[PDB]
Design a protein around this ligand. Structure first.
Ligand SMILES: *[C@@H]1O[C@H](CO)[C@@H](O[C@@H]2O[C@H](CO)[C@@H](O)[C@H](O)[C@H]2NC(C)=O)[C@H](O)[C@H]1NC(C)=O
Ligand code: NAG
Lengths: 50, 50
């Protein structure tokens, strides 16, 4: 299929219209980052020459 | 098969037709003794960055 870019939304704009939140949700969006690669080290002569 | 290592008794069974086994590295990782048909593991001699 041709992918959706998300639902369409004609915003209800005008020169005198504002939408103010009556209420909220706190939410706990997890974010994940790598920090340390695995600490490899190589004995290149034991690798190359056994 | 010339090489250097720590020979020990080994638990993992060879099938009767197998003579030796390999690491993914293609280097040998277990062998049969050609006289008495027991299986020996070939662990590497210990090493590290002084
Ligand atoms: C604001 O939104 C919260 C939900 O995010 C509303 O809290 C719920 O309120 C109903 C009764 O109206 C309770 O039965 C629920 O248990 C409440 N939910 C939680 C998570 O506690 C809250 O009432 C809304 N307040 C206003 C003024 O709109
Ligand atoms: C060959 O080695 C096995 C044990 O590994 C032994 O039983 C056998 O007697 C040896 N062969 C001869 C001719 O002695």
């Amino acid at each position: 299929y041709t992918m959706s870019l998300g639902a369409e939304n004609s915003v209800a704009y005008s020169n005198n219209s504002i939408a103010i939140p009556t209420n909220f949700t706190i939410s706990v969006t997890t974010e994940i980052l790598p920090v340390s690669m695995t600490k490899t080290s190589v004995d290149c002569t034991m690798y190359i020459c056994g | 098969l010339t090489g250097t290592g720590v020979l020990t008794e080994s638990n993992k069974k060879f099938l009767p037709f197998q003579q030796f086994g390999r690491d993914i590295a293609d280097t040998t990782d277990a062998v049969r003794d050609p006289q008495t048909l027991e299986i020996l593991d070939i662990t590497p001699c210990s090493f590290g960055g002084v």
